């Protein structure tokens, strides 16, 4: 009988091991033990992104945001989901929000967020070109 913390740590190991469905299931067990922890949901969302299930990832991002409205990663992963689902305007807004929150929180992710924004804006422009 592992604790929620142990399950989260096991999921993290499985993630390092690139065992994404297994990791996601572990985070699910963590959520069962304590469903009030936003990080279990954002961790599982990243697994779902790796598994090409952005809709499942999006629902987890929403659950995380209900628990922690200031979550940088929940906004960033939500942006990634929307990008995959071709909701470009919303994706860019979420990535820009992740950028703003990371700044407000004085967090440092190097160039990860601006790089993701650039990818999102390009993808948006390419979608416009693909239609004319």
């Amino acid at each position: 009988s592992p604790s929620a913390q142990e399950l989260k740590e096991q999921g993290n190991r499985l993630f390092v091991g690139r065992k994404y469905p297994e990791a996601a299931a572990c985070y699910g067990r963590a959520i069962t033990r304590n469903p009030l922890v936003a990080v279990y949901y954002t961790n599982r969302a990243l697994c779902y992104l790796k598994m090409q299930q952005p809709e499942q990832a999006l629902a987890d991002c929403r659950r995380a945001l209900e628990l922690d409205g200031q979550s940088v990663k929940a906004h960033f992963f939500l942006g990634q989901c929307q990008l995959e689902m071709e909701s470009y305007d919303e994706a860019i807004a979420n990535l820009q929000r992740a950028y703003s929150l990371a700044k407000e929180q004085r967090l440092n992710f190097g160039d990860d967020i601006p790089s993701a924004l650039r990818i999102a804006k390009k993808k948006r422009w390419n979608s416009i070109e693909e239609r004319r």
């Binding site: 954002t42 961790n43 960033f76 992740a98 992710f109």
Partner: peptide
Amino acid sequence: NPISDVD
């Protein structure tokens, strides 16, 4: 820290 990673 990298952003696309688990916590």
